[PDB]
PDB file of C-alpha atoms in Angstrom:
ATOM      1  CA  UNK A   7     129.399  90.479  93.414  1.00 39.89           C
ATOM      2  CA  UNK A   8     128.057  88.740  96.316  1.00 41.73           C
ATOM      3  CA  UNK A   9     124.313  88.628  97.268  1.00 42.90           C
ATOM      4  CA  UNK A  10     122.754  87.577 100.300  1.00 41.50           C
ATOM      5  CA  UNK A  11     119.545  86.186 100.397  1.00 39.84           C
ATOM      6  CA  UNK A  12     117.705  86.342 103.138  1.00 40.22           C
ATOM      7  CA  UNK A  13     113.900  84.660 104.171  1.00 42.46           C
ATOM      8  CA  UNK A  14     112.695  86.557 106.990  1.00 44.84           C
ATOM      9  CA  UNK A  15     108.929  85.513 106.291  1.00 44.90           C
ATOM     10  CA  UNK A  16     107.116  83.143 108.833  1.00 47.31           C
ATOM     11  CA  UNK A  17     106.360  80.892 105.224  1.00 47.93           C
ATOM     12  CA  UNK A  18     108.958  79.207 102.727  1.00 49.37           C
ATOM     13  CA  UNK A  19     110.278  81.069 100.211  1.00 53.65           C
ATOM     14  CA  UNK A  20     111.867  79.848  96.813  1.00 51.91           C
ATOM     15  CA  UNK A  21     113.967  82.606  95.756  1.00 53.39           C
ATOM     16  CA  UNK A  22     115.035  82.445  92.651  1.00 56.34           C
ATOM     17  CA  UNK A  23     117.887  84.732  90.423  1.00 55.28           C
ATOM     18  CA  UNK A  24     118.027  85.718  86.625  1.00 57.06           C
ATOM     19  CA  UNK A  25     118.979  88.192  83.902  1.00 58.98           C
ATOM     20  CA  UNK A  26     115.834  86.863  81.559  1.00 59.43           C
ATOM     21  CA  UNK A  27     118.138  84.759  79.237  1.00 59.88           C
ATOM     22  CA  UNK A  28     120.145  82.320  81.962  1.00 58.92           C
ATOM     23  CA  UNK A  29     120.298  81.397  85.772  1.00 56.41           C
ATOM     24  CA  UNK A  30     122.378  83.780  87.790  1.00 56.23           C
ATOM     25  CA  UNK A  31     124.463  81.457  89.899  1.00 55.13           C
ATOM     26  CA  UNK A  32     122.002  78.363  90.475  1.00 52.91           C
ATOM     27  CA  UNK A  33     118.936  80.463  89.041  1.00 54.76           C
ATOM     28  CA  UNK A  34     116.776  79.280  92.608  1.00 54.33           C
ATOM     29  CA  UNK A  35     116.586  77.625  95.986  1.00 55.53           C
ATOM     30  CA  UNK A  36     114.265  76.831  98.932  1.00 56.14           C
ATOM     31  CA  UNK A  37     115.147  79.057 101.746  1.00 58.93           C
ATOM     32  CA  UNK A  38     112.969  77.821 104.523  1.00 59.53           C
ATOM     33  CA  UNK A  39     112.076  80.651 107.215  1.00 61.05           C
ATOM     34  CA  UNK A  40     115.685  82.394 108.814  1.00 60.45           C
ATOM     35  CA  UNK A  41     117.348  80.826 106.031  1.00 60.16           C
ATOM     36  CA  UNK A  42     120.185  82.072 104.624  1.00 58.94           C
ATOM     37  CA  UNK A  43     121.453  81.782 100.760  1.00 54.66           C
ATOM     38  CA  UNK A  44     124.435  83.207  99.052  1.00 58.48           C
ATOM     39  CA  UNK A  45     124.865  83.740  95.430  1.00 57.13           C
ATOM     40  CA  UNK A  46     127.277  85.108  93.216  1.00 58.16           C
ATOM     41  CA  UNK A  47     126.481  87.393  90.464  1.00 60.80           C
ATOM     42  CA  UNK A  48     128.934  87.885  87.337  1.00 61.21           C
ATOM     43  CA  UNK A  49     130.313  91.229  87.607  1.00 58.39           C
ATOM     44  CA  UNK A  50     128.625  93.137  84.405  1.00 58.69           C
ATOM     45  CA  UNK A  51     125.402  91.761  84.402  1.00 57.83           C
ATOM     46  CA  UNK A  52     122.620  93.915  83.471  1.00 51.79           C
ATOM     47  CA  UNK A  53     118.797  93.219  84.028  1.00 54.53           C
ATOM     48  CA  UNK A  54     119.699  90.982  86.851  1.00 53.25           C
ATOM     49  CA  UNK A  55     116.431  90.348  89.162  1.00 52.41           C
ATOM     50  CA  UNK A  56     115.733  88.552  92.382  1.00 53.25           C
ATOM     51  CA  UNK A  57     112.319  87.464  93.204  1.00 55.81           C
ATOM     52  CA  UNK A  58     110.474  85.125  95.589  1.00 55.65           C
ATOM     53  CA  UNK A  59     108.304  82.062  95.030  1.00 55.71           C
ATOM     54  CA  UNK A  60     105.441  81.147  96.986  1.00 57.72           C
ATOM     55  CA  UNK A  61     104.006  77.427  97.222  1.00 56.39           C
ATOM     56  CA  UNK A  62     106.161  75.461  95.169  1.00 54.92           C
ATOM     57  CA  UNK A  63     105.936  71.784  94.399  1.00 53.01           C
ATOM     58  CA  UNK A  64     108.703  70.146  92.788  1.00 55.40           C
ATOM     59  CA  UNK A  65     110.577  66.333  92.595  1.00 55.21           C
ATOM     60  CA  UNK A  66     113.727  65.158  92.642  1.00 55.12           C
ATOM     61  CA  UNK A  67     114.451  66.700  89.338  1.00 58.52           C
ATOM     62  CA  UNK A  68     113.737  70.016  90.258  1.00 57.31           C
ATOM     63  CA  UNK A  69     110.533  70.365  88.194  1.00 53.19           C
ATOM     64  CA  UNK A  70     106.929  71.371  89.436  1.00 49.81           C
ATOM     65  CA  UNK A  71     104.973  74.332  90.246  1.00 49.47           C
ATOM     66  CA  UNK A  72     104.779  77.352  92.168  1.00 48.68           C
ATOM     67  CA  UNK A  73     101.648  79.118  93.098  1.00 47.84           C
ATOM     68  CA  UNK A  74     103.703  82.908  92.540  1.00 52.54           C
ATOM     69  CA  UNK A  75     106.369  83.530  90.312  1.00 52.43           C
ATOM     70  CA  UNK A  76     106.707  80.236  88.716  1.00 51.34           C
ATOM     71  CA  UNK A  77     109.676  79.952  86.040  1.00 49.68           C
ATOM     72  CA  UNK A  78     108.912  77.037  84.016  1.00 50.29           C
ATOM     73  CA  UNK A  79     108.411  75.159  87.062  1.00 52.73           C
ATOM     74  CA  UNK A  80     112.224  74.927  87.439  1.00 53.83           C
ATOM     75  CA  UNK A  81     113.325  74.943  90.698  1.00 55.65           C
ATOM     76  CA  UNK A  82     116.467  76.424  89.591  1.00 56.34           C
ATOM     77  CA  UNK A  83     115.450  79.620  87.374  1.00 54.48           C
ATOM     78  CA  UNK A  84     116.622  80.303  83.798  1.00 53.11           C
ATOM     79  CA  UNK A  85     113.799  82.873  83.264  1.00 54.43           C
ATOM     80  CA  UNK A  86     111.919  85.565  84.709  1.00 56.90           C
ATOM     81  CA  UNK A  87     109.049  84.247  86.838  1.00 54.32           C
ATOM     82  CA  UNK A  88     105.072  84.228  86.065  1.00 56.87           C
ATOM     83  CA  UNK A  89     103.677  87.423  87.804  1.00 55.60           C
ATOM     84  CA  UNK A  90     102.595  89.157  90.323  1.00 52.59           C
ATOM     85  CA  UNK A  91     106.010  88.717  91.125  1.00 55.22           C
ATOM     86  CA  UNK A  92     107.916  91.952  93.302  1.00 55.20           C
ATOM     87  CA  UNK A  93     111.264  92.742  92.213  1.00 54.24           C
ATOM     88  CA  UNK A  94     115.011  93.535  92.803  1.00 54.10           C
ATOM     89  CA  UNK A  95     116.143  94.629  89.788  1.00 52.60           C
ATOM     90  CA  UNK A  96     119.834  95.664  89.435  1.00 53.37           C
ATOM     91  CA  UNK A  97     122.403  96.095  86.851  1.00 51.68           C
ATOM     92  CA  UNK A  98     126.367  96.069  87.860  1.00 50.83           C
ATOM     93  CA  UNK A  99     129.399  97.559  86.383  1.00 50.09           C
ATOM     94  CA  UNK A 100     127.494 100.090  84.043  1.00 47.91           C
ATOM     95  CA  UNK A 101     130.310 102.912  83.310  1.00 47.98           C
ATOM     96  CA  UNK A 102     131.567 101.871  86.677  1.00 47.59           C
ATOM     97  CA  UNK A 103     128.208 102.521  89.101  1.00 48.08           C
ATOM     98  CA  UNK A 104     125.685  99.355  89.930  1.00 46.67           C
ATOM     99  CA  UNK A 105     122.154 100.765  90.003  1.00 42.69           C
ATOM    100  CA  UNK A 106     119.570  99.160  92.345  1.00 44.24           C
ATOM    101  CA  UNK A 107     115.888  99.351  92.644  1.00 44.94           C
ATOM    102  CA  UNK A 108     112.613  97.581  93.571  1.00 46.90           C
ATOM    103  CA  UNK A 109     109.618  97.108  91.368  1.00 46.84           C
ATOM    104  CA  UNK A 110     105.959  96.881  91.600  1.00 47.34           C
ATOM    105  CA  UNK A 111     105.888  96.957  87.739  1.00 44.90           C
ATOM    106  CA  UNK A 112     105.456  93.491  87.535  1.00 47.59           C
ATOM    107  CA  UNK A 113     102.968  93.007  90.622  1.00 48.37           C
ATOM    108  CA  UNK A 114     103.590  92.361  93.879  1.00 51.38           C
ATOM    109  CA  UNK A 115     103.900  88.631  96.235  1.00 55.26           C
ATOM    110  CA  UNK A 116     106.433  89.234  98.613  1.00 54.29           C
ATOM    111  CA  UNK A 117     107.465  92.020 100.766  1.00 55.01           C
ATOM    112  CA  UNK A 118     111.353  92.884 100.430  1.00 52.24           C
ATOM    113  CA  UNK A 119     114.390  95.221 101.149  1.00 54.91           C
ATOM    114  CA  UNK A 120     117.370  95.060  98.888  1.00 53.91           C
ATOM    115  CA  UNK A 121     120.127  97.331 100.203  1.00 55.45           C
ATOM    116  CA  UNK A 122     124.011  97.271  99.809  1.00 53.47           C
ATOM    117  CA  UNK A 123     126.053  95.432 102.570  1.00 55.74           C
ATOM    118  CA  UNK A 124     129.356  97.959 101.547  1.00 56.48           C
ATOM    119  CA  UNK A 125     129.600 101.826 101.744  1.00 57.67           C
ATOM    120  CA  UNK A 126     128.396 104.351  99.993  1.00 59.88           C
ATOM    121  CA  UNK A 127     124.708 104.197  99.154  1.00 60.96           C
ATOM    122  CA  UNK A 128     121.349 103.588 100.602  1.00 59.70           C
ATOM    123  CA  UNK A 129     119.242 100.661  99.937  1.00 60.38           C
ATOM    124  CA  UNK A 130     115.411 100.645  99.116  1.00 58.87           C
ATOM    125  CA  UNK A 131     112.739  99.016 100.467  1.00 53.40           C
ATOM    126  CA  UNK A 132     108.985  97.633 100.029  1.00 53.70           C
ATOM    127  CA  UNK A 133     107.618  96.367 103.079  1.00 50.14           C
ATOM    128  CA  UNK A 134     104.109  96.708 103.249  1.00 53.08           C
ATOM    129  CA  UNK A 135     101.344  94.451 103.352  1.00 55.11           C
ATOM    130  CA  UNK A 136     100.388  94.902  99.178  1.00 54.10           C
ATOM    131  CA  UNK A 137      98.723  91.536  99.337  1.00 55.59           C
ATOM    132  CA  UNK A 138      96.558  92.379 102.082  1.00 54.12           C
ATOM    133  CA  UNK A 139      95.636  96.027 100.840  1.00 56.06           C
ATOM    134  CA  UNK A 140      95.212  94.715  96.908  1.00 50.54           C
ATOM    135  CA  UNK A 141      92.582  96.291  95.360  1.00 52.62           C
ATOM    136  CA  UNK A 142      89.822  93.534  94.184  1.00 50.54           C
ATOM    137  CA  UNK A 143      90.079  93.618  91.186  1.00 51.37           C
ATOM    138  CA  UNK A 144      93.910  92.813  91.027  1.00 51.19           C
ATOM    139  CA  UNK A 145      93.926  90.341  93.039  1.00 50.03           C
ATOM    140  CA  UNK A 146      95.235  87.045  91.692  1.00 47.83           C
ATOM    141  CA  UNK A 147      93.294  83.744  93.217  1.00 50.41           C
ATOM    142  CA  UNK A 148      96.923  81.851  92.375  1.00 49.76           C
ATOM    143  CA  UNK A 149      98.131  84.480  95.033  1.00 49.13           C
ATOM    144  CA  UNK A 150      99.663  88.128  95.571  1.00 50.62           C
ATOM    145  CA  UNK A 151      98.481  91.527  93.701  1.00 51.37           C
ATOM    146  CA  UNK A 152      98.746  91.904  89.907  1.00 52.24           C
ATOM    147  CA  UNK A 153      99.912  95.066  87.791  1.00 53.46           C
ATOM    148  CA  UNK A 154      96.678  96.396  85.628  1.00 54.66           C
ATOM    149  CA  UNK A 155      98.558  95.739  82.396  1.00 57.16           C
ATOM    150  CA  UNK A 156      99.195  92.088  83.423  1.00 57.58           C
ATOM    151  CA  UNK A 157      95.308  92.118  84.173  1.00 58.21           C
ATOM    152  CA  UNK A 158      94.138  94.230  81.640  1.00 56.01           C
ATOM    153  CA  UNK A 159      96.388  94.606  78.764  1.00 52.71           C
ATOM    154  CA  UNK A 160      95.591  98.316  77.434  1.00 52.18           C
ATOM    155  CA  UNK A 161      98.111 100.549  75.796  1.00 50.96           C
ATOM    156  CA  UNK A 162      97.907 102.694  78.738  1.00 51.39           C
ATOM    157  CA  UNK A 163      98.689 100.256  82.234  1.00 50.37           C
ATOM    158  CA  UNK A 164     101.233  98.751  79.505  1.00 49.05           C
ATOM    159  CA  UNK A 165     102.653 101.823  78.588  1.00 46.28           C
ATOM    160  CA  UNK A 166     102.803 100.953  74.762  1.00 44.76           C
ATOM    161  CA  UNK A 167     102.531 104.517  73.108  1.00 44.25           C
ATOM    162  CA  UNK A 168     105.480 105.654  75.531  1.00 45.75           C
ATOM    163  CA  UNK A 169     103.358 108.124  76.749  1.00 48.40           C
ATOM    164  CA  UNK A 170     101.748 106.489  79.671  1.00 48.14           C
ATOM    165  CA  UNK A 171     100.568 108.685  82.862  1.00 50.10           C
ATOM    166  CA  UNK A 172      99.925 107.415  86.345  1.00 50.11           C
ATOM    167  CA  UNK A 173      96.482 105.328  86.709  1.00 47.78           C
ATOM    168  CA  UNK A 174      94.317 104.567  89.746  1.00 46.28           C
ATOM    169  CA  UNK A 175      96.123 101.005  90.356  1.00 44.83           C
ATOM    170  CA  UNK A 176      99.542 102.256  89.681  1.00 45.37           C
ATOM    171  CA  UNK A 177      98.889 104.729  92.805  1.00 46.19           C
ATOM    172  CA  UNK A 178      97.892 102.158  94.712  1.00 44.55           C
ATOM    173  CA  UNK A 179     100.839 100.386  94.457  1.00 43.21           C
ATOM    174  CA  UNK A 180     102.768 104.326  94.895  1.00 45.93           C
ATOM    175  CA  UNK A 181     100.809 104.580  97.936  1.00 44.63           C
ATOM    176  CA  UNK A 182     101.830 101.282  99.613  1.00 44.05           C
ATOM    177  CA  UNK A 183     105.295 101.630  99.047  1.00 45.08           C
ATOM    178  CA  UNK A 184     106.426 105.220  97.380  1.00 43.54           C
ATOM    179  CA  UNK A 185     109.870 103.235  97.111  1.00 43.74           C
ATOM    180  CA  UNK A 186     109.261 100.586  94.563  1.00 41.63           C
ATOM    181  CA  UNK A 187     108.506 101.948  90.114  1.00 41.61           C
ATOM    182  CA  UNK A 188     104.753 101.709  90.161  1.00 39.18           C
ATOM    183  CA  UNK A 189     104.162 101.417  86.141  1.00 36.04           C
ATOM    184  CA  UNK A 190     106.819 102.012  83.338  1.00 35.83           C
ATOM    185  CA  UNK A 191     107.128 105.844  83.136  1.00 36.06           C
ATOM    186  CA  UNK A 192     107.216 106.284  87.064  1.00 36.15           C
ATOM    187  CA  UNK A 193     109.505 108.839  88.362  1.00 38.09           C
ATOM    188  CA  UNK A 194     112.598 106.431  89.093  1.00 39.17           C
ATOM    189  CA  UNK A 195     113.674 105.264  92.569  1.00 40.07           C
ATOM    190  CA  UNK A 196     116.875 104.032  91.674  1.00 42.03           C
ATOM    191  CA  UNK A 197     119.501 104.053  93.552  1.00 36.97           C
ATOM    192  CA  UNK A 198     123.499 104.600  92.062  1.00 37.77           C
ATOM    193  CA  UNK A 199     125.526 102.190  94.176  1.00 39.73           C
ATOM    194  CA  UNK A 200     129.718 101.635  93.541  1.00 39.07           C
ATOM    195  CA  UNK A 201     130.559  99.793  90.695  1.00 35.93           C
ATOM    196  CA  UNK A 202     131.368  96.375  92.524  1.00 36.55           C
ATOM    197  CA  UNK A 203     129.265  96.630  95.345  1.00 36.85           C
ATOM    198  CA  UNK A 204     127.877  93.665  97.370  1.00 35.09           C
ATOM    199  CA  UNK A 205     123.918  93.277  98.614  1.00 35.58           C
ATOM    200  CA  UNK A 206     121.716  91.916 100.582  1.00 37.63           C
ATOM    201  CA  UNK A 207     118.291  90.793  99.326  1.00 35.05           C
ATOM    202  CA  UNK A 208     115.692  90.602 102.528  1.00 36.75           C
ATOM    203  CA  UNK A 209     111.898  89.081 102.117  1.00 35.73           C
ATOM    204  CA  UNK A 210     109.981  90.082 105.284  1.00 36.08           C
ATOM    205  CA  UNK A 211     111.914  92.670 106.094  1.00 34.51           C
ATOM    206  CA  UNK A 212     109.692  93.952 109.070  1.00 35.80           C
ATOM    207  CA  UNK A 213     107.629  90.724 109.788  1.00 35.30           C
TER     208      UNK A 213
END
């Protein structure tokens, strides 16, 4: 499957691609603003995700830092990425559907759409200014808007139990963008895409 990933923010962005336990094609990249990179995704994988980076130092060996959703300070991702970090999360090939969706689960840094570039399902979106909005005492002074259970680590914003309910933060992120899972137990916003389709991943997708 084919993903295109598009920086439509006025900033550079180091997107970056994983299933957790390896790289998905080269695992990151700097896509400077308008830049265009395409990746290819194994056909199968599940608990793929696509993120951005913000503010990312690194040498000629690829190592360094990134002020969001650092992964090891790799510059080409094995690993999921040090939160607030907003998500496209998909799995492909799964009794022959991909599903798709965004999530907020994780925090937010990045405005993005991720929607199919082939027929036969919509694509979802989280576009607003979460950053800007972020209630204060989420925000992360390394950058972006934290999930409470990153921040505060109860059984309830982490949804431990199994039991969780919806919590003043996680509506705030509901309320920003209705689109995008707001804590574990959200109702789903997941979209069921053909089994092989191809996508485009956009950050600044109104800018």
């Amino acid at each position: 499957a084919t993903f295109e990933i598009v920086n439509r923010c006025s900033y550079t962005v180091w997107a970056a691609a994983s299933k957790g336990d390896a790289a998905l094609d080269a695992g990151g990249r700097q896509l400077n603003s308008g830049e265009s990179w395409t990746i290819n995704v194994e056909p199968g994988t599940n608990g793929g995700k696509i993120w951005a980076r913000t503010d990312c130092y690194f040498d000629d060996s690829g190592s360094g830092i990134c002020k969001t959703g650092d992964c090891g300070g790799l510059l080409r991702c094995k690993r999921f990425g040090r939160p607030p970090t907003t998500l496209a999360e998909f799995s492909l090939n799964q009794y022959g559907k991909d599903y798709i969706d965004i999530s907020n689960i994780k925090g937010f840094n990045v405005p993005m759409n991720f929607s199919p570039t082939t027929r036969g399902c919509r694509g979802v979106r989280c576009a607003a200014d979460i950053v800007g909005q972020c209630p204060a005492k989420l925000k992360a002074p390394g950058g972006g808007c934290n999930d409470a259970c990153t921040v505060f680590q109860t059984s309830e914003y982490c949804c431990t139990t199994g039991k969780c309910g919806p919590t003043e933060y996680s509506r705030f992120f509901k309320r920003l963008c209705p689109d995008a899972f707001s804590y574990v137990l959200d109702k789903p916003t997941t979209v069921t895409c053909p089994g092989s389709s191809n996508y485009r991943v956009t950050f600044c997708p109104t800018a």
